[PDB]
Amino acid sequence: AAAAAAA
Amino acid sequence: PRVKGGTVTRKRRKKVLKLAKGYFGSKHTLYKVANQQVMKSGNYAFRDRRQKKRDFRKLWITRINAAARMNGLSYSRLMHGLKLSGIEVNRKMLADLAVNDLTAFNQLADAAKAQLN
Amino acid sequence: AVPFRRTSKMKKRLRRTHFKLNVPGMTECPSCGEMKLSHRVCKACGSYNGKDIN
Amino acid sequence: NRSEVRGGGRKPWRQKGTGRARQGSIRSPQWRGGGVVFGPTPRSYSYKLPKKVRRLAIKSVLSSKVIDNNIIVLEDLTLDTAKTKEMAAILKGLSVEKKALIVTADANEAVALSARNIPGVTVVEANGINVLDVVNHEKLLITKAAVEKVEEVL
Amino acid sequence: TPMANASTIERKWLVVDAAGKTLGRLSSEVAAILRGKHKPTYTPHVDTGDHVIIINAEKIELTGKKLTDKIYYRHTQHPGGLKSRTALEMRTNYPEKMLELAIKGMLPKGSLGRQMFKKLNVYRGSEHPHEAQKPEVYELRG
Amino acid sequence: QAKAVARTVRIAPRKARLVMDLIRGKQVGEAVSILNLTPRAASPIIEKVLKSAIANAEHNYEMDANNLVISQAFVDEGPTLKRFRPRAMGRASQINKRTSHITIVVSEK
Amino acid sequence: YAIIKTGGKQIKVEEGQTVYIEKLAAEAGETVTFEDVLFVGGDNVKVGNPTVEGATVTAKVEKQGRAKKITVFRYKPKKNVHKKQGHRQPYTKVTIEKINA
RNA sequence: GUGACCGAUAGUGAACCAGUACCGUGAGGGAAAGGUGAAAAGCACCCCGGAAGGGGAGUGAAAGAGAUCCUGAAACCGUGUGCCUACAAGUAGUCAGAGCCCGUUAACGGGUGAUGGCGUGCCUUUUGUAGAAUGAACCGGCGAGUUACGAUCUCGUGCAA
RNA sequence: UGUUCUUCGAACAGUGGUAGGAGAGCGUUCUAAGGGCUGUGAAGCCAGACCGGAAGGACUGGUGGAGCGCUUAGAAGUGAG
RNA sequence: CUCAACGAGAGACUCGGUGAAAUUAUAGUACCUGUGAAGAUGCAGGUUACCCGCGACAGGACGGAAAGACCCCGUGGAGC
């Protein structure tokens, strides 16, 4: 996936 | 019993830091870079104690080549003449001091001239 | 926007070369002194060329 | 030990998410709360040599004191009063200046109450002899009854 | 223990004529002169070499088809900054920095290399303004 | 030579050095008037230390204060008071209330 | 000046000059001689068919001593290999006089 | 009453107004923090300063001993001074090396060093790391092959079918 | 360091090294033995151009103001990047 | 937007007062082409570059922040 959704 | 061990560690650190005196910046101040610099200096000291023995020799070869080319011969012909004109084992930095004491080098050069023909 | 390496002492001192501030334009007050900065009323005597105007 | 320190079992912070170490216990051995995994533990240092070695040890140390001429034999140890001045005069009369043993077969009370204030002198019974008092004092004063006891005891 | 000169070096002035030699074979000899390889008092860290003057730089020649094939590049720090000229255009207009680029290529790289580059003097022929130094004529070894 | 030390007054040392680097080495008659006009509000504290040093020269040694000159003008650091400032999302950043030792030594020229 | 090999390395010496050579024993305080002298010098005599007769150079031994200590530390820059060793090279200091031809 | 038990990051969490301060609605979690001097004899008095804080003068064996107060290291911050630095691309060292400045546990002396040659930190994990793979801002302290009971082997001692 | 001869010892050969195996040592705390330094100055701290093959150890000068070291052994809360 | 141009206020800029944080092996920390754990500020060859700042931009430092969430393994777990 490699989704950049860092919180 | 309990062992604290407070002083021997600081003695080691100060021995390393006094061995690393004169270094740039934090390398004469902080222990953990001073120890690495001292170890690297030990490797460099061993390597350069090996390398000095041959770069001095190449400097003396250069100076003997210049002094021989003043007299009309190259370095290789001069050394071949020295091995042919008797077995003379005259070492090369004494041959380099022989041009500080000219014209003693010219007489050995003429001795090389004599039996190359 | 994050410092990769820390600044050494020498680079910090080189950057702080121009951080110093200058001496003000201070001159002798003709009434009393000492001393009085140029183009301002003297705080001691309250005079300016040359009346006591406070 | 790590279990016996007065400390909670919770973890101070969660396992992931913070940029810190894991640190599952409040007082792990790397913490300031202590600290020891092994440590000293209460134990007995007692062990027994075989009996022939014990008899050989006591006989050999007695023979080594005999060949060094440090043995003094005093028959019956006659002491009139309970004063330690008389015992000090007796030790002075036999040229004893360093530490000494006094071996008494019947364990006389006048001998026992005396010479215990002198720091280098230890009064011991005939069967109460041992390796350390013989090697420690380097001179023994032994009665004839004590010799005639320890010859058949050991 | 061996001798190592420092602030006692005597430097002479030499005149090298480039009428018939190559770019080329003389440039290595001039670089060896500037390094000090001809003197027995050579010390590699103090620049024992001496001054040299080159005259008739326009009379230099180079063999083969290098007059149209040899290309000099002077790339800037800008994109698309590659500027090029042939050896004929570099000889015809000003061959002085042709000769100095040859010497700079054959000199060592460093502070001493930039120092020994300063002793080189290349002029369009056949006069030089260094007659006050009284230079001597040097003949090439070959 | 007379010496006056401030010893833990509330001023950051880096801000005091910005005045002390230029006040150093000057005559004391040309030193108070520099401090009056800079303004750089550590300079009243440096003025108090300077007048204390001049008075110590006049009263304890009688050094004829019109001939004095500043000799040593070093700034040291005192103990730091630790304060915490609340930030966004519960960060609790640290605030250092810096403290300096101001020392002025005057002597003859 | 004369050309002396006694190391086994070749050295160039003057009259009355103190030199440092390798640790030959010499029973220090006793006169030591060098017999393998090349190129006797002075009149600039060539050397050939070496160790010629009549080339005798004598010396006076003053000290049997130690050089400055060298800490020979070598480590491979990985692999946990460390090696520390001090070195103390012995020498012989002689004073050379009466060069003979 | 005794420790081949600890000595203030140790030893009880707690040598000190400690289950205290503080955190949590609550159950609960839970600190940091010892040392003047033998005796306060704890700086009378003078000067600067609003005060704090200093400089003299006294007490004291010591005041650099003056209220977190015995000794006081390092990271860090400064002030002076000897030698080098504004044409130089450097894991910052090492070998060679002139000049300048000093004299030591007098010893082929110490400090700084223009310039040349060589030279891509330490650890971990890897076939292979200068690695643009991991860890460390720095300094100081603490921090991981122990102990109980059995078994086996080597060595030593005692007695020996 | 290993082998031979063994006439103080000599000759010859060997001595890069990870995982690992074997051997010899240096330091820290406490205890037993004697012996010995200490306010005419201990431990600790700071500096030095000293010594040893290494871990390390001494000697001077300053600070410090009361304990420490040596020996042959023995135990370990036994050495930090 | 074609296609952007002015004007007002707050921050940013200067001065006075006070004053952090993420990060950080040391660092005197250029470019091109190659080489190399195969994408170099530090390696090799060459090309450039006096020393120290201030205001801006963000191409790189495989930037920082979270022991990748995807994929696989664990004879790990949990919910259905």
From Swiss-Prot, chain B:
It comes from the Bacteria. GO terms for biological process: ribosomal large subunit assembly; translation. PROSITE patterns: RIBOSOMAL_L20. InterPro entries: Ribosomal_bL20 (IPR005813), RIBOSOMAL_L20_CS (IPR049946), Ribosomal_protein_bL20_C (IPR035566). Pfam families: Ribosomal_L20 (PF00453). GO terms for molecular function: rRNA binding; structural constituent of ribosome. Keywords: Ribonucleoprotein, Ribosomal protein, RNA-binding, rRNA-binding. Part of the 50S ribosomal subunit. Belongs to the bacterial ribosomal protein bL20 family. HAMAP family: Ribosomal_bL20. This is Large ribosomal subunit protein bL20. It comes from Bacillus subtilis (strain 168). The gene is rplT.
Curated annotation (Swiss-Prot), chain C:
InterPro entries: Ribosomal_bL32, Ribosomal_bL32_bact, Ribosomal_zn-bd. GO terms for molecular function: structural constituent of ribosome. Coiled coil: none annotated. The lineage of its organism: Bacteria, Bacillati, Bacillota, Bacilli, Bacillales. NCBIfam families: rpmF_bact (TIGR01031). Belongs to the bacterial ribosomal protein bL32 family. One of its GO terms (cellular component) is large ribosomal subunit. GO terms for biological process: translation. Transmembrane segments: none annotated. Keywords: Ribonucleoprotein, Ribosomal protein. This is Large ribosomal subunit protein bL32. It holds the Pfam family Ribosomal_L32p. Part of the 50S ribosomal subunit. SUPFAM superfamilies: Zn-binding ribosomal proteins.
Swiss-Prot record, chain D:
The keyword RNA-binding applies. It comes from Bacillus subtilis (strain 168). The chain holds residues 53 to 206 of 207 of the full protein. Residues 1-33 are annotated as: Disordered. Belongs to the universal ribosomal protein uL4 family. GO terms for cellular component: ribonucleoprotein complex; ribosome. It comes from the Bacteria. One of its GO terms (biological process) is translation. This is Large ribosomal subunit protein uL4. One of the primary rRNA binding proteins, this protein initially binds near the 5'-end of the 23S rRNA. It is important during the early stages of 50S assembly. It makes multiple contacts with different domains of the 23S rRNA in the assembled 50S subunit and ribosome. Forms part of the polypeptide exit tunnel. GO terms for molecular function: rRNA binding; structural constituent of ribosome. Residues 8-19 have a biased composition (Basic residues). Keywords: Ribonucleoprotein, Ribosomal protein, RNA-binding, rRNA-binding. Part of the 50S ribosomal subunit. Transmembrane segments: none annotated.
From Swiss-Prot, chain E:
One of its GO terms (molecular function) is mRNA binding. GO terms for biological process: negative regulation of translation; translation. InterPro entries: Ribosomal_uL13, Ribosomal_uL13_bac-type, Ribosomal_uL13_CS, Ribosomal_uL13_sf. One of its GO terms (cellular component) is ribosome. Keywords: Ribonucleoprotein, Ribosomal protein. It holds the Pfam family Ribosomal_L13. Coiled coil: none annotated. Belongs to the universal ribosomal protein uL13 family. Part of the 50S ribosomal subunit. Binds to Obg (AC P20964). This protein is one of the early assembly proteins of the 50S ribosomal subunit, although it is not seen to bind rRNA by itself. It is important during the early stages of 50S assembly. This is Large ribosomal subunit protein uL13. The gene is rplM.
